[PDB]
């Protein structure tokens, strides 16, 4: 039931996509909001689909949905209730799946393509950059009330797995890993923001974070994302010594074909899911694909 098994027992590496903001703004979207996904998903759903399609064309084997900040908590500020919010969250999956369908028409040989439902941290709902600090404090029960509607909406709309990403807080991580056991068929990767090579943003030694996630077979991969490019390889090599789960790495771009240069380094550090975060485009993926 591991959706990675199809691809990883055929290739050492699989490619994720990259930032969506970048090609929405080149397509003419103004996003000066943290709840920008609400407007686009409603006003310009097609643009999001087209961004997914472009990453697929560029070599991406997995779309990450536009749900990073699509929570009932977040969208309540736009006067949307939980069910209105879940319909949007689910739309983000449908859009990525209609993109995938479109890409298979253009390329019948393309192989297995995945859709990962994006699950942002609580810090991304607090518009403060806390997702790279994790200096927030909630009960496990509290994180779970936060995450559940999105988790159900992502799964109900057909995500092949959840992308639990940009995670700074160890308590939130355990809450999320506890939450997923309520949905036995769900599979997820857990990806973290760091303070350093050996620690989560909040301070937790990565040893603790792995020992925990080790006990949840639903967590089918883990690693790091939205990390500076220069900080990726040290973190990976440390993870690599704690787990042989497939490792995940998608860092910020180097500037502002070079993120792509780390490929060999990462793969040797056990990385098997590779893509990009802030400031990346389909160009970064095409370069990864060229170097594989
Ligand atoms: Cl993005």
From Swiss-Prot:
PROSITE patterns: HCY. It is an enzyme of class 2 (transferase). The gene is mmuM. InterPro entries: Betaine-hCys_S-MeTrfase_BHMT, HCY_dom, HCY_dom_sf, Hcy_S-methyltransferase. The keyword Amino-acid biosynthesis applies. Residues 1-292 form the Hcy-binding domain. Keywords: Amino-acid biosynthesis, Metal-binding, Methionine biosynthesis, Methyltransferase, S-adenosyl-L-methionine, Transferase, Zinc. Its EC number is 2.1.1.10. Zn(2+) binds at residues 226, 277-278. Catalyzes methyl transfer from S-methylmethionine or S-adenosylmethionine (less efficient) to homocysteine, selenohomocysteine and less efficiently selenocysteine. Monomer. Its cofactor is Zn(2+). One of its GO terms (molecular function) is S-adenosylmethionine-homocysteine S-methyltransferase activity. It catalyses: S-methyl-L-methionine + L-homocysteine = 2 L-methionine + H(+). SUPFAM superfamilies: Homocysteine S-methyltransferase. One of its GO terms (biological process) is DNA damage response. Coiled coil: none annotated. Pfam families: S-methyl_trans (PF02574). This is Homocysteine S-methyltransferase.
């Amino acid at each position: 039931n591991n959706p990675l098994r199809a691809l990883l027992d055929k290739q050492d590496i699989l490619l994720l996509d990259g930032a969506m903001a970048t090609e929405l703004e080149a397509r003419g979207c103004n996003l000066a909001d943290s709840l920008w996904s609400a407007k686009v998903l409603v006003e310009n759903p097609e643009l999001i689909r087209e961004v997914h399609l472009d990453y697929y064309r560029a070599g991406a084997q997995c779309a990450i949905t536009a749900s990073y900040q699509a929570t009932p908590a977040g969208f309540a500020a736009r006067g949307l209730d939980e069910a209105q919010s879940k319909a949007l969250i689910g739309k983000s999956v449908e859009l990525a799946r209609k993109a995938r369908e479109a890409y298979l028409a253009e390329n019948p040989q393309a192989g297995t393509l995945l859709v990962a439902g994006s699950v942002g941290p609580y810090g991304a709902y607090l518009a403060d950059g806390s997702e790279y600090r994790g200096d927030y404090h909630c009960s496990v029960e509290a994180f779970q009330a936060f995450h559940r509607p999105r988790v159900e909406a992502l799964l109900d709309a057909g995500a092949d797995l959840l992308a639990c990403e940009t995670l700074p807080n160890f308590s939130e991580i355990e809450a999320l890993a506890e939450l997923l056991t309520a949905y036995p068929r769900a599979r997820a990767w857990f990806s973290f923001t760091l303070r350093d090579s050996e620690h989560l943003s909040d301070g937790t030694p990565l040893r603790d974070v792995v020992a925990l996630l080790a006990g949840y077979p639903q967590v089918v991969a883990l690693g790091i994302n939205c990390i500076a490019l220069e900080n990726t390889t040290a973190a990976l090599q440390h993870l690599h010594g704690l787990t042989v789960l497939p490792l995940v790495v998608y860092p910020n771009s180097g500037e502002h074909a070079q993120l792509a240069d780390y490929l060999p380094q990462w793969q040797a550090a056990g990385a098997r899911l590779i893509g990009g975060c802030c400031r990346t485009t389909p160009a970064d993926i095409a370069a990864l694909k060229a170097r594989s």
